Amino acid sequence: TTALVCDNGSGLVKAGFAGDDAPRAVFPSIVGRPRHQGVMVGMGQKDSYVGDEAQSKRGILTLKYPIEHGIITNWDDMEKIWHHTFYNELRVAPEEHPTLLTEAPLNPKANREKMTQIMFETFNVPAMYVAIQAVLSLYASGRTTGIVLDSGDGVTHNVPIYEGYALPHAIMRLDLAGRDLTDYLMKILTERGYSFVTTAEREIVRDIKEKLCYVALDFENEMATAASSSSLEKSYELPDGQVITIGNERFRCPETLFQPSFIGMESAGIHETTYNSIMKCDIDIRKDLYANNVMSGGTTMYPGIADRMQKEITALAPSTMKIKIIAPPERKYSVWIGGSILASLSTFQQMWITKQEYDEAG
């Protein structure tokens, strides 16, 4: 009777119970199979690992990301991820819980149908529903019209939504997100003279990104500021206790979102894809999209990112337009939270697809 909410991302699965204010399980969306025969002491032979243990044991495994740029691309592996989610992470029997799943903007219909078939036929859920991630994020902010920027580990989208209706002709997809920024930070820190050779050293770079980086309001001025003083430097103590000190890499890293050319990508930056998305919509709803730009996803967490989007959109939009960026503090889990709310609403209960209905349709 308690519903589940499973938000599957390119990098992380966020899963938990509808009505809770945060996912209880958040773990890497990866499956690893051993490259060699053997066991861990005290254990039997295992055919695969999922999530945290796959990452921690990666050295003897072959890894697969079943979700690429938000879209499920390997079904056997995705089935392993859902199985792990239900039984190992949430520790529930999926046959006794309605399950809400999320999907990316523009997910092909055949993909959603396959998701649906697996939930009913493999996991035997009593009911389920598939929601668009961006729309859930808009909902989580108490809004039913607006434009969402959703940026995760693998993909960034802009999705304009009008009275709950995501407008697919105006959705923009940018194949640049957190994983790219982590790799770029490793690159520029290496150019400064640091080295990240072992697996443990390399894993630290994502933590540096998450703790030290930020988006400059004026990039060229910020570069001058970093060059003329040490005021922008910040230190990061490595596991061993050695403390390192980083200046302009802090803001050069997420600047890539506004200038994808930093990573060799000939593509508009997120301010311009936002604007292009709005301009694809009827002129008469644009005022409502500009005044309701909601940021969602881990890659929107950089300090400064809302102020910078406000500046750049202001420069693109008509001079009299009210522009507002909404960047909730919980926004790394916004899609999940929107699902937890929606699945809880009394007015939603008639929207579940039941196994009875599935049993009669297709």
């Binding site: 204010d21 108490g142 809004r143 609403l345």
Partner: peptide, 22 residues
């Protein structure tokens, strides 16, 4: 005054979520 109008209005009013402790 349909169910969808009802649903959207409810989305706008919000929901009291249970705290998930660290």
């Amino acid at each position: 005054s349909d169910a969808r109008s009802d649903l959207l209005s409810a989305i706008r009013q919000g929901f009291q979520l249970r705290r998930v402790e660290e």
